[PDB]
Symmetry: D2
Subunit: 290 residues, 4 copies
């Protein structure tokens, strides 16, 4: 089962928007060698919202190839429509993905019945496990505890990843669904607290620049070595707090560049961090560098 | 020559498989033109642009242009989160025969004004046809301030702005600020008569699809300053807006057009079509405004 | 029947919070001589949210005394509880108010029935007309058209004032309620547009610093002289954009001070406009 | 130093708004006896937003007299103006309060410099410790980490209580201020998680109906018996979930009534829980 640290991979592209498979390959290889427990391309940090059909496929294909089945590859599938999401899910599964991170984007408001049919449609489209994505603080259409409970009844919907800051929400989900739905968090949640209350891991952008420390934190929490976990959590939280002001995709791409990875810049109109903003990323990175 | 009057936000007719129904779109556009509308705007919010892929979008714009036969201008909605994608769309619709571009900025991560401005200038620089700036700060994650709007108006190709919010007072601030450099179009969230009173040049809306002759009549009455008659009509057309307000507009207009004989289909799932009970409520308002 | 321009009077106080009844009186008198059609103390611009019971009574009392029955005085009644609102309404009526501007403040969310009960309680406590206040864009608990329609059935709920920017909502109210509920707008709506669609007037802070022009605009609209009304409307609308990013009470108090009224400053924590910010007030005023 | 479980006391009043001191006293007494480490009157659950100046004083006085200095009493001070907040704070301190829970209510937006001036004024008005109240998810004007850090420099601002669901920000606060600002959470935060990350306790309404369990949870966390604490946390969290759809003051009052306290109903327009809703409260109380 999926667990531990899944870095939200940035999507490396050149000026023309062409995906850099080679750069993505060494990054994925290095992250795996650092001990990450999975990889998640096309998450928010991966700028899925700015990439077309071809670019997304290219991102997913490159990740799958570089991983070589070493760790599960959960591919983000975001769409406003059922047909498009189903097409993506089937394609990524066909390419070799191990899981689907189902993301519902909404334009016109949707009732709970419609919201449920979307996720159910994606699950019925593939044979690999689905991870429901949720963030009531950003999404125009999200999931109520009841909808989540009904979805967990699907044989292949077995995980959920909440990216809001409402950690209490996570405890309610676990109290309600137990093991039928394993919980993943994002950087908006304190990893140590998520693990304390019953979560199984986290998918986050920062894990890209601090993979070993993130894995270490995960291990400490699992071993119940809370005092040591918290020492480390405070330091890693300072990293998030520093990033919590910039476009996260632009932030991780800047940090990865400072570490030697030619990931390029975010897709315009997004702006790359300025020399001054980058200097700040540089300082936070150097502080936790081992 | 300048864009003015009533521009229906065309629905996007598709089958259960998602294939655009060019023939149905054709008869609809032809009927709207005969009804006297002043322009056509496919791929607006009512056209479900957010639910159509690059191939379906091209099929829609194509079908609309062919049908229009240059009888009225066709303003194609270009919506995207990226400059590259938006530029590609605009150049494509311009090539297909579009007379203007309704530039819609979709955002994920927040953007600062300079970036927001760069998006619109990229589109305007990519084509030679006029650009209509789309704005609705009540729904859009990244919208435009009056200063950005004023800077954008300085571009020779950006000559119109269409506001879909309910904030009519903002339209007057824009007019006071930009004057003729930026001609104002409203949507159904604004009262048409009020917009014309303060200086707007027309409106692009979904309801215009089911009440084209009445919309055109309202426009003319306002232009001729026959306010008493314009308002008698406005009060009636507003009741229609009020009834649709509780529904997914695209779902509403599609159900409305079906009642009028257009096999436009249902909205793109996960969107739901209006239920039988909801369709009766729509058939009700139509009957009341039917001339 | 209430109509025309109702200035949202600022509430003049000294640094100690003591109301300057003397200054309020001269202001009200000057506004009445300017031709305003009514006065509304304790509206948002009057900083009702920052004044205590005694301060509020002092403000209303000062306004009524200076008005001398020349124009109706509609007093703002804002509260989170029925008991407190009823107490204020009964007090202002006793002091001689001609109407009550009922404002529901909410902390915990309220269902429509409870919201409706708040307004009915105020209306049942007095014999003078009640003006329902509404601004869905700011209020925590507001009114749906259905609730407004039911409230309009009460014999004393005869008006509604909407402070949102959603002018379309006003037309929906008018189509639904007709003369059972006459509509007033605030500075967020374009005055001429409100009059065009059937509104009867407006209650706003900017009227305090440009009374005569505001009255002239109203008269032109009533006389259906739209061409001239719009020319004037375009000029007056500049005030709204100029104060857009500032505390409205701060703006009107600064403006009035520039016109010679010792109205004092907003009640702390609110800050008075800085010298730099005041330039926008000097500017728009010279322009009008 | 303030720590542990501080029940957010409900404010018992009759249908006419009169505070029931006798009732409040019996409730405080049993709470103290149950082991709570402190009492916090006039918090959100105490309907401070629906209570006038006199009622608030009655609540505070009734709580202090009942506590008999057995546990510290932190009185909620909520206001939109500095003058009113300072008066309240000085009064409660005078009555014998051990701390002030400063709550900033806003109408017009306030810049950081003004928000800071509000809290500092309160802190400058009393000699007892000040607890900064914050909830960015509900308050119109709240505090950034920078403002919080600046306020922590004040000799008497020594605690902060966050009622949002954003536990991550509590850690950001702890990392920045440390010992200078001890952190308290509320129902929206998972108590076990707050204690794990460095918090010192919590102030919440649910502690009123489940004091012994709440205290037990606290001790378990402090003793670092995380397995037992989490088993207990899961149960007590079912409580947070059950009320999620109701007025918290109405739930706690209904819950206390079921436990034998004649605390009465919430202040209208708020509605008391219906029978169907009280049965629900009955079940959660039975579950633990």
């Amino acid at each position: 089962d999926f667990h531990g640290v899944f870095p939200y991979l940035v999507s490396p592209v050149d000026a023309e928007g062409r995906v850099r498979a080679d750069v993505m390959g060494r990054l994925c290889d290095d992250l795996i060698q650092a001990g990450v427990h999975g990889l998640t391309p096309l998450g928010s940090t991966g700028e899925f919202a700015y990439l077309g059909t071809a670019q997304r496929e290219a991102v997913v294909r490159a990740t799958i190839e570089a991983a070589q089945r070493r760790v599960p590859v959960v591919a983000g599938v975001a769409s406003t429509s059922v047909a498009d999401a189903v097409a993506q899910a089937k394609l990524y599964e066909k390419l070799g993905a191990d899981g689907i991170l189902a993301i519902l984007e909404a334009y016109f408001p949707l009732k709970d019945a419609q919201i449920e049919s979307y996720f159910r449609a994606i699950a019925d489209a593939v044979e690999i496990p689905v991870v429901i994505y949720t963030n009531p603080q950003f999404q125009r259409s999200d999931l109520t505890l009841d909808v989540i409970a009904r979805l967990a009844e699907h044989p292949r919907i077995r995980y959920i990843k909440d990216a809001s800051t409402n950690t209490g929400r996570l405890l309610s989900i676990i109290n309600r669904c137990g093991d039928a739905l394993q919980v993943f968090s994002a950087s908006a949640h304190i990893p140590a607290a998520v693990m304390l209350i019953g979560g199984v891991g986290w998918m986050a952008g920062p894990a890209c620049i601090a993979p070993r420390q993130s894995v270490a934190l995960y291990e400490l929490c699992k071993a119940q070595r809370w005092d040591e976990a918290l020492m480390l959590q405070r330091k890693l939280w300072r990293v998030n707090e520093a990033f919590a002001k910039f476009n996260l995709a632009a932030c991780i791409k800047a940090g990865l560049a400072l570490q030697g990875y030619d990931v390029g810049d975010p897709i315009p109109p997004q702006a790359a961090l300025t020399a001054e903003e980058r200097k700040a990323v540089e300082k936070v990175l150097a502080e936790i560098a081992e």
